[PDB]
Every structure is written in structure tokens, then in C-alpha cells.
Amino acid sequence: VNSFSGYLKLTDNVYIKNADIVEEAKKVKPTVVVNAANVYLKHGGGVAGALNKATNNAMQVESDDYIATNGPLKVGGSCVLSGHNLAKHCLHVVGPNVNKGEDIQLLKSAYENFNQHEVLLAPLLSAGIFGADPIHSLRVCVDTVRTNVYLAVFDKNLYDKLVSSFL
Ligand SMILES: O=c1[nH]c(=O)c2nc[nH]c2[nH]1
Numbered sequence: 001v002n003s004f005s006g007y008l009k010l011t012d013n014v015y016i017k018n019a020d021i022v023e024e025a026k027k028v029k030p031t032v033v034v035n036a037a038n039v040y041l042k043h044g045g046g047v048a049g050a051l052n053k054a055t056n057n058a059m060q061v062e063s064d065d066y067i068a069t070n071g072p073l074k075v076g077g078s079c080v081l082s083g084h085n086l087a088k089h090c091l092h093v094v095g096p097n098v099n100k101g102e103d104i105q106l107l108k109s110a111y112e113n114f115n116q117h118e119v120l121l122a123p124l125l126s127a128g129i130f131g132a133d134p135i136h137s138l139r140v141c142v143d144t145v146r147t148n149v150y151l152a153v154f155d156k157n158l159y160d161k162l163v164s165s166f167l
Pocket residue numbers: 019020021022046047050123128152153154
């Protein structure tokens with residue numbers, strides 16, 4: 001048993017809810033919250049801007065030190081950092097950004113990072129301002145992630161479309 005509430009079960013391991021990933025993290029304090037990161041860990045907008053704002057910029061301060069030491073992530077890659085006030089850990093995952101020309105085939109590699117964690121609270125990778133089709137992102141999630149993933153879809157209208165169209 002875990003503390004996630006009000007999710008619709010899609011598969012053996014994937015759950016979905018119309019919820020802000022921020023408010024959900026604050027309520028649940030999951031072991032792992034996923035950030036929709038970029039390779040620079042510059043948390044300006046979308047999931048990254050909202051999560052970072054909720055940490056009072058501490059996420060950005062930690063991230064800048066990580067990049068200064070390690071250099072940029074790979075598209076499709078990840079790193080584990082603090083979850084600050086939101087979670088034990090934040091898994092910063094870089095899905096391809098279609099609005100920058102990145103290979104959508106990298107979305108499967110991005111979701112493979114989730115398999116290193118038994119349970120996660122996550123957004124749909126490469127959705128929103130990353131420009132991918134969220135229906136596609138949910139299909140890759142279901143077909144790639146084998147650990148237990150709780151998906152927080154911000155947009156009520158999109159949530160209903162994702163559920164209604166789910167195969
Ligand atoms: O503020 C937010 N922005 C988002 O893009 C998002 N996705 C899930 N939950 C979210 N909250």
C-alpha cells in the first residue's frame with residue numbers, strides 16, 4: 001500500500017490523475033518526484049519552473065552547482081538530486097524537446113530512467129512546452145516503465161482526453 005489517492009489505474013503499474021504535480025508532491029511527499037528537466041537544469045517554465053518556484057529557488061541553486069561540477073545531462077538522461085520540501089529525491093529527467101528539434105525516439109530512453117526507482121510521482125515526459133503529443137507520451141510510458149508510476153496531468157481537458165483515448 002502507498003499514500004497516492006484518487007488515481008485511475010491504467011495498467012498493472014501505471015496510474016493517472018488530474019492534478020498539479022506541485023500540490024500532489026506537497027501533500028504526498030513521495031520518495032521520488034520527477035522533474036521535466038532540460039540538459040542545463042535551467043528550471044524556467046512548465047514542470048521545472050513550477051517545481052523550482054515551490055522550492056523557493058533552492059532546486060535551481062542545487063542544480064547550478066550540479067552542472068558546474070558535472071556538465072550538462074544528455075537528452076534521454078537523468079540525475080538524482082534533492083527533493084527539497086517536495087519529496088525525498090527529485091529525479092531530473094530530460095525528455096526530447098520537439099520545439100528544439102530533438103529525436104522523439106529518445107522519449108523511450110527518458111522513461112527508462114524511471115525503472116531505477118520502485119515508485120515515482122511524475123509528469124508526462126516531453127508533454128506541455130516540450131512539444132510532444134501527450135497521448136504518445138502516455139503510450140511510451142506504459143510500454144517502457146515497469147515500476148509504479150503515478151502520473152499527475154495538470155490540464156483537466158487533457159486528462160479526460162488521455163483517459164478516454166487510452167488503449
Ligand atoms: O504548474 C504545473 N505545471 C505543469 O506543467 C504541470 N504538469 C503537471 N503538473 C504541473 N504543474
